C-alpha cells in the first residue's frame, strides 16, 4: 500500500520557493546531500562504539555518487544510520519546522545558506522534478519516500532489492539540469564543496 501525506505548511512553502525562485547557483544541492550522508555515517559509527551489533547490517561506511544519463537520475548512496518510518512521516519534518521558518525569514540572505538551517535536503528541488528516497534503519523496514512537491509526499514499504542499511537519494533531474550527470561536473562540485568529508566518496562511471 502507498500512503500519501501533506507536507507541513511551512515545508510546502519552502519547497515552492526553492522550485520557483530564480537562482543560478544550483550546484549546492550536492554538497547538502553529501553533508547529510556524512552526518548519517557519523551517527551509525558513533552508535556502533557501544553496540557493535549495529554494524551487523553492514560494516562499510561510504558514500557513492551514481549518475545515469539513461534514467536521467543522479543517486547519492550512503551506508549511514538510515531513516525510520516515523523519521520519514513526522519526526524529521518536525525538526525542520524551526529551521524552515528561520531560513525563510533570512531570505526575506542567499539560498546557498540553506544547510545552516538544517533543511539542506530540500535543495534537491533546485535540480530535481521528483526525488525518491530509499532508506533502511536497523530495526525498521526498508521504505521508499517520494515527492514531486506540489504539497504531498508518499511513503511505502520498498520491494526493490534490499540495502542492508543506509539511504539512497534518487534525483530525477529536470530536463535542463543534465549537467549534473557529467563526471567532470560532479568532480568539480565535490572538489569545491566537499573536499574534507571524512568518508570515501566514490563517483561511479557510466557504462
Ligand atoms: C526525506 C526527508 C524525510 C524529507 C528528509 C531527509 C533528510 C536528511 N536526513 C535526515 N536523516 C538522514 C539520514 Cl539518516 N540519511 C540521509 N542521507 N539523510 C538524512 O531530512 N528529511
Interval between CA 70 and ligand 1 midpoint (Å): 26
* Strand order, beta sheet including 142-147: 2-6, 152-157, 142-147, 128-136, 166-173, 73-78, 63-68, 201-203
SS3 assignment, position 49: coil
Pairwise CA distance, residues 191 & 175, whole Å: 25
Pairwise CA distance, residues 175 & 135, whole Å: 26
Domain count of the fold of the chain: 1
Per the entry, the structure determination technique was X-ray
> In terms of residue numbers, what domain contains 110?
1-207
Pairwise CA distance, residues 133 & 114, whole Å: 20
Centre a 10 Å sphere on the Cβ of residue 181 and count the other Cβ atoms it contains: 20
Index of the ligand 1 atom closest to the CA of residue 87: 3
Index of the ligand 1 atom closest to the CA of residue 92: 21
80 CB less than 6 Å from ligand 1? yes
Interval between CA 84 and ligand 1 midpoint (Å): 10
Is there a binding annotation on residue 36?
yes
The three cell numbers of residue 102 are: 528561520
Which strand (E) or helix (H) includes residue 191? helix 183-193
Residue nearest to atom 2 of ligand 1 (CA): 88
Pairwise CA distance, residues 125 & 111, whole Å: 12
Q: Which of 172, 126, 175 is nearest to 27 (CA)?
A: 126
* DSSP letter string, 106-175: HH---GGGGGGGT-GGGGGGGTEEEEEEEEE-TTS-EEEEEE-STTEEEEEE--SS--SSEEEEEEEE-G
Amino acid at each position: 500500500e502507498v500512503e500519501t501525506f501533506a507536507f507541513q505548511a511551512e515545508i510546502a512553502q519552502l519547497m515552492s520557493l526553492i522550485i520557483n525562485t530564480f537562482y543560478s547557483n544550483k550546484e549546492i544541492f550536492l554538497r547538502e546531500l553529501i553533508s547529510n550522508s556524512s552526518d548519517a555515517l557519523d551517527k551509525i559509527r558513533y552508535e556502533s562504539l557501544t553496540d557493535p551489533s549495529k554494524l551487523d547490517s553492514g560494516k562499510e561506511l561510504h558514500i557513492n555518487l551514481i549518475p545515469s544519463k539513461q534514467d536521467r537520475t543522479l543517486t547519492i548512496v550512503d551506508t549511514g544510520i538510515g531513516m525510520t518510518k516515523a523519521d520519514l512521516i513526522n519526526n524529521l519534518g518536525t525538526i525542520a519546522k524551526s529551521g524552515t521558518k528561520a531560513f525563510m525569514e533570512a531570505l526575506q540572505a542567499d539560498i546557498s545558506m540553506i544547510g545552516q538551517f538544517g533543511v539542506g535536503f530540500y535543495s534537491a528541488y533546485l535540480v530535481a522534478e521528483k526525488v525518491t528516497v530509499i532508506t533502511k534503519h536497523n530495526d525498521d523496514e526498508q521504505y521508499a519516500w517520494e515527492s514531486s512537491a506540489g504539497g504531498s509526499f508518499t511513503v511505502r514499504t520498498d520491494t526493490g532489492e534490499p540495502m542492508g542499511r543506509g539511504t539512497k537519494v534518487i534525483l530525477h533531474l529536470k530536463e535542463d539540469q543534465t549537467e549534473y550527470l557529467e563526471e567532470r561536473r560532479i568532480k568539480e562540485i565535490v572538489k569545491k564543496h566537499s573536499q574534507f568529508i571524512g568518508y570515501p566518496i566514490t563517483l561511479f562511471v557510466e557504462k
